[PDB]
Write a protein that binds this ligand. Structure first.
Ligand code: ANP
Ligand code: ANP
Ligand code: ADN
Ligand code: ADN
Ligand code: MG
Ligand code: MG
Ligand code: MG
Ligand code: MG
Lengths: 298, 299
């Protein structure tokens, strides 16, 4: 691991938002004009944010036969994100979330696993990047990645919504091969209960535990110190989703650019502040200069 | 209208079809292992089943920028289905359905209208077919079709999943220009609540009212009589989705082939029994010989 470059491993996924009046009762149908498409998936959100910040990124994801000359493939190619490590299924569609949201803002999500079925027949390559960041995807494959990369590339891990799938054993084992561990508060609360861990137990295993708290900021724990990172004010909150992935993008981009962990947290906080300003996880990702400028005022 | 042919008016669509044990509640997520899109849309489904039964069909639908030279178009053309009257949008996508089936084969659907927004800009052509079958779609365009066709071509009407879009007044007016009216048990209930109609009110306006009841069969009401149509066993029920439209394809094909209303119902029922054996509304559409062979095994 040597090049100014981060590998993101895990979901590259299409999200489709369906705004409805009311969800259908049994034996009924609803009709809607259209669904809005968004480029998502935790790994691809992070990879695209890293690239936007001027750090080369590569993606390792299982995509499907619709990926494939369509919108998502060309959009990534256009941003110069390395997608040479993608696995292309002939049998299944690209993972995607179909998100149906009513007028009172209640939501029902159908996630298509689809091409992600292929991870269990795959094994990770040697990585040549400074950091291998492991996001939602297939936990067994993600553990293979962490075990292969650790002690060679820096490992970043953010189990996210996959958390419930990890056994205590398996979660322990991946954390033992992790350098940066990121979790939101609910995730951290969940994992700690599983593992019977307190903060000090994590720090016996990882170099930095980062717990994000949305609008209340974040905190970085190291063997040495606790670093409190403020929330950075957005222009106006539209879609609070994608704040997660983009904080990770900022943090890891800053780390590869050679800044200390405090400033990495600050850049993370400032990156996320741009992302909440629009619908979609990738639609308002900032440049490095814009991040540094926003941080400069607050 | 005099060609031994049927016009099908209404949606052509791509369908995702899912099996769940129970329908998800508000504020909940479900993972689907695997999904595939199927050729769908009520009007297209009927037009394909009709052709498969050996009756010429034509299709009128609004399709999207994902149609000209795509897999669906080439498939319909390969079928010798007249698609010359289709409207291709330049900016809207082909309509799409997400269909969920629970363990008791209840279904819910979500339907993206897309190119069907264009119906408000269009008017029907003259029809030269024996039957014009209106299968879902836009209420105002459908009323134009029925008013256009009525007393010239036989009008069959099956508002289907789009029924909620009909005001009482528009639904009433289309029925007054309808010869054959087809509804699900669910649709018939809602329709009758909306209209405040009993069976005989329908029969003052239409020649035949066909109410299907899934695995309980169906009933044909005319001014003269009530004809009970049994459910005809299928071999292993996989997907109920295509049952409704393939019943209309069988019923209307048999009608054009000159058989009486009872036999039309029996043919609809046996056609549907084949379609429910595979996922996708058009996957296991049967030939006329297969359907008849199955029918005579009954009775
Ligand atoms: N409303 C907000 N305004 C400004 N910055 C925010 C806001 N919400 C979050 N952030 C920043 O972005 C980071 C990520 O928030 P986070 O706690 O990970 O959200 P989350 O619980 O993961 N929800 P999601 O982003 O949809 O997965 C935080 O550490 C905040 O600094
Ligand atoms: N399980 C079955 N096996 C054999 N034939 C069936 C079965 N279910 C339905 N049919 C036939 O198909 C006809 C139409 O059923 P139908 O009343 O349209 O069900 P449905 O609720 O509309 N399906 P859907 O609208 O997609 O949820 C019936 O009258 C039956 O003859
Ligand atoms: N249940 C789930 N499991 C894994 N990934 C998901 C799930 N729901 C949504 N995602 C994807 O992950 C990203 C954020 O977690 C979104 O862009 C979305 O596509
Ligand atoms: N709400 C709806 N409006 C119109 N057509 C629908 C709806 N839901 C499902 N469909 C379609 O009806 C068919 C079954 O009759 C499917 O092929 C599907 O495309
Ligand atoms: Mg260790
Ligand atoms: Mg997250
Ligand atoms: Mg129907
Ligand atoms: Mg009359």
């Amino acid at each position: 691991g040597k090049m100014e470059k981060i590998t993101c491993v895990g979901h590259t996924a299409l999200d489709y938002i369906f705004n409805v009046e009311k969800f259908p009762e049994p034996n009924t149908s609803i009709q809607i004009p259209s669904a809005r498409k968004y480029y998502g998936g935790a790994a691809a959100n992070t990879a695209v944010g890293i690239k936007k910040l001027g750090v080369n990124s590569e993606l390792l994801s299982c995509v499907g036969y619709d990926f494939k000359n369509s919108g998502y493939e060309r959009y990534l190619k256009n941003l110069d994100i390395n997608i040479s490590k993608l696995y292309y299924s002939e049998e299944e569609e690209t993972p995607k979330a179909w998100i149906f949201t009513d007028k009172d803002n209640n939501q029902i999500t159908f996630f298509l696993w689809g091409a992600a079925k292929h991870y269990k027949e795959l094994n990770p390559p040697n990585f040549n990047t400074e950091i291998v960041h492991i996001a939602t995807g297939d936990p067994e494959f993600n553990l293979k990645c962490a075990k292969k990369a650790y002690g060679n590339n820096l490992v970043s891990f953010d189990p996210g919504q996959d958390l419930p799938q990890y056994s205590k054993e398996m979660l322990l084992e991946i954390i033992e091969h992790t350098n940066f561990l990121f979790m939101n508060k609910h995730e951290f609360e969940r994992a700690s209960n599983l593992l019977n861990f307190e903060i000090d137990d994590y720090l016996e295993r990882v170099d930095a535990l980062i717990v994000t708290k949305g609008s209340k900021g974040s905190v970085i724990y190291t063997k040495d110190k606790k670093i409190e990172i403020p929330c950075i004010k957005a222009g106006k909150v539209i879609d609070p989703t994608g704040a997660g992935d983009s904080y990770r993008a900022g943090f890891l981009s800053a780390y590869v650019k050679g800044y200390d962990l405090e400033k990495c947290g600050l850049i993370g906080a400032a990156t996320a502040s741009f992302v909440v300003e629009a619908k979609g996880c990738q639609t308002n990702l900032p440049t490095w200069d814009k991040v540094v400028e926003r941080l400069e005022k607050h």
